[PDB]
Write a protein that binds this ligand. Sequence first.
Ligand SMILES: CCCCCCCCCCCCCCCC(=O)O
Length: 136
Amino acid sequence: RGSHMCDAFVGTWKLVSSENFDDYMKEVGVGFATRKVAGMAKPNMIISVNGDVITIKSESTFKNTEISFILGQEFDEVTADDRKVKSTITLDGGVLVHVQKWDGKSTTIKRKREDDKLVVECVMKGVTSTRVYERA
Ligand SMILES: CCCCCCCCCCCCCCCC(=O)O
């Protein structure tokens, strides 16, 4: 009912820069055609909070996806590249930390506020991709 910690994430955000995303997708195991088309996308990310439930939507020409979750509570996620993963998202000192597990593999996506930006760091096996979003 009062202000939530994650309120700083709430809003509509647009992708403005990406680094190393193709390499990150390769490490995750994303196939050629999906990497090419997904790498071209300039998504909007819409984040909202309602009680304990955080919703993150990604809208792009490639795919529209949405996840809703409670911090610390594992859920099923079908990713944009059609991985069926088990996901858990927590808040660690202001940073949303999203761990995806599938097929004995794991990747971590961190989302944080930096100045007026929302910075998304995707990490797989030593490869990091940084994606920067600004308010739409
Ligand atoms: C981010 C949506 C468009 C690109 C879809 C990428 C599909 C393959 C990789 C899935 C990992 C998703 C990484 C999230 C990064 C982000 O939201 O910008």
